[PDB]
Amino acid sequence: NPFQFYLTRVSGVKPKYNSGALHIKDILSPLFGTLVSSAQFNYCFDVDWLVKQYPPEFRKKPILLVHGDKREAKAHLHAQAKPYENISLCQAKLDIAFGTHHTKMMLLLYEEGLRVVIHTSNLIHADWHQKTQGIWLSPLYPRIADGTHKSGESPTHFKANLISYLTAYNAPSLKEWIDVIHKHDLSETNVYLIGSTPGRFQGSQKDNWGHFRLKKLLKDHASSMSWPVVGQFSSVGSLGADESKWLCSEFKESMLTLGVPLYLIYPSVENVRTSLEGYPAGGSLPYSIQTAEKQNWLHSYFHKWSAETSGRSNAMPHIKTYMRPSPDFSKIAWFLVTSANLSKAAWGALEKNGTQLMIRSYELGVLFLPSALGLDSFKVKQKFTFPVPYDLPPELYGSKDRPWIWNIPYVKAPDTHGNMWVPS
Numbered sequence: 001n002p003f004q005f006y007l008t009r010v011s012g013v014k015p016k017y018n019s020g021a022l023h024i025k026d027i028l029s030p031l032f033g034t035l036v037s038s039a040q041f042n043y044c045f046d047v048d049w050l051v052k053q054y055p056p057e058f059r060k061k062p063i064l065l066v067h068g069d070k071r072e073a074k075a076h077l078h079a080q081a082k083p084y085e086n087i088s089l090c091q092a093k094l095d096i097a098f099g100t101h102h103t104k105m106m107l108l109l110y111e112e113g114l115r116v117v118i119h120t121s122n123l124i125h126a127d128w129h130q131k132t133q134g135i136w137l138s139p140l141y142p143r144i145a146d147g148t149h150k151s152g153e154s155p156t157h158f159k160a161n162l163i164s165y166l167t168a169y170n171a172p173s174l175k176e177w178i179d180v181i182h183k184h185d186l187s188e189t190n191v192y193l194i195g196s197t198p199g200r201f202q203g204s205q206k207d208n209w210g211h212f213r214l215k216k217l218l219k220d221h222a223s224s225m226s227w228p229v230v231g232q233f234s235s236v237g238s239l240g241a242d243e244s245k246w247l248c249s250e251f252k253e254s255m256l257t258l259g260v261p262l263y264l265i266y267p268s269v270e271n272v273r274t275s276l277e278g279y280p281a282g283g284s285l286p287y288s289i290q291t292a293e294k295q296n297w298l299h300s301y302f303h304k305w306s307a308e309t310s311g312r313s314n315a316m317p318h319i320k321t322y323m324r325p326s327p328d329f330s331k332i333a334w335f336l337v338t339s340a341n342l343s344k345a346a347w348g349a350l351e352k353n354g355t356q357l358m359i360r361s362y363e364l365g366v367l368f369l370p371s372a373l374g375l376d377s378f379k380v381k382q383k384f385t386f387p388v389p390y391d392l393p394p395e396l397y398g399s400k401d402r403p404w405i406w407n408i409p410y411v412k413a414p415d416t417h418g419n420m421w422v423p424s
């Protein structure tokens with residue numbers, strides 16, 4: 001299995017739909033390695049829940065929580081962590097307004113080597129219960145023979161790129177993790193890292209992050225052969241007064257690069273209303289009416305969440321994926337799973353007449369390119385060749401459909417659990 005791409009377990013579907021799926025308890029189990037230390041990068045944390053996901057034998061090993069919380073929220077997290085002597089925190093600097101530390105990553109240092117997990121789930125129970133979420137699992141990276149001279153680098157430059165990503169935090173506690181990574185052999189890695197980090201980037205530095213990083217990799221490591229672009233996500237930023245301001249101009253321009261129909265997949269109200277969670281699934285789909293009302297034009301690109309292929313049409317998506325399928329959707333030129341939602345905050349926007357890329361947040365994903373496996377393209381696995389986790393082709397919103405908008409009421413029809421939704 002060359003991809004090592006997994007979905008999280010969903011409670012309450014037929015067990016057949018959880019056969020190749022992973023819960024965090026599985027990821028942290030002793031079968032995966034004898035744990036010594038770990039770092040947990042994320043956005044939201046429930047510390048009591050998190051510690052419980054570790055096997056009892058490992059619960060006292062050091063854990064570093066990497067977060068972006070400030071003021072009172074930061075206070076709250078420290079309070080959550082206080083009781084656990086083995087837990088340290090690293091506040092990632094967020095010097096730009098409206099940025100978040102949104103990266104979901106685990107660094108797992110074992111007696112036997114090192115593992116990197118890049119995923120989409122917050123570290124709270126509900127994100128691992130009945131949502132569609134995605135995971136990439138690195139191989140077990142061995143320590144470099146303490147007596148030999150090797151880079152430990154892969155053809156995709158994953159090791160150097162991961163170090164550069166951690167270096168951007170400028171954080172004492174991560175330097176230690178950087179040193180650990182230095183000591184291991186990551187040469188078997190066959191994916192490319194795509195990161196976002198907060199800043200304003202000029203010239204050559206523009207290629208390092210966000211959608212320009214993606215553009216760069218697609219220019220260099222894909223070849224060009226009407227192949228649509230698909231974007232799928234759970235949060236929607238303010239994209240501008242029309243499609244030409246950002247979405248179709250710089251964003252789509254990066255996505256269609258190689259060596260055009262745009263499908264966007266975002267749950268409708270109906271998708272949410274009849275999900276396994278009902279309306280409260282919408283708590284993790286924070287599209288606000290203030291944003292939506294500025295950009296009604298966007299919604300003509302929206303397609304319903306549908307995942308009969310994975311038994312997950314009723315498990316609302318918190319995964320974010322981007323991809324480039326062929327005209328008949330039977331193959332893809334590339335696939336990306338990442339933390340990055342559909343916002344300029346996450347992906348970058350051009351400033352100062354296009355000489356500067358502004359990114360607000362930390363984001364992280366892995367790009368699957370056929371060239372890294374010695375191929376031109378991947379055939380799509382039609383029944384969860386690349387395991388695309390939702391149905392193709394994507395289905396357009398019907399005429400009575402609306403995008404899920406979190407902060408308005410839904411009181412005309414009850415959800416799965418016989419409840420209404422009145423946010424306030």
Ligand SMILES: NC[C@@H](O)c1ccc(O)cc1
Pocket residue numbers: 043044122234235283284285286
């Ligand atoms: N702000 C916390 C809550 O609204 C939330 C947190 C994480 C998400 O991915 C979506 C929503």
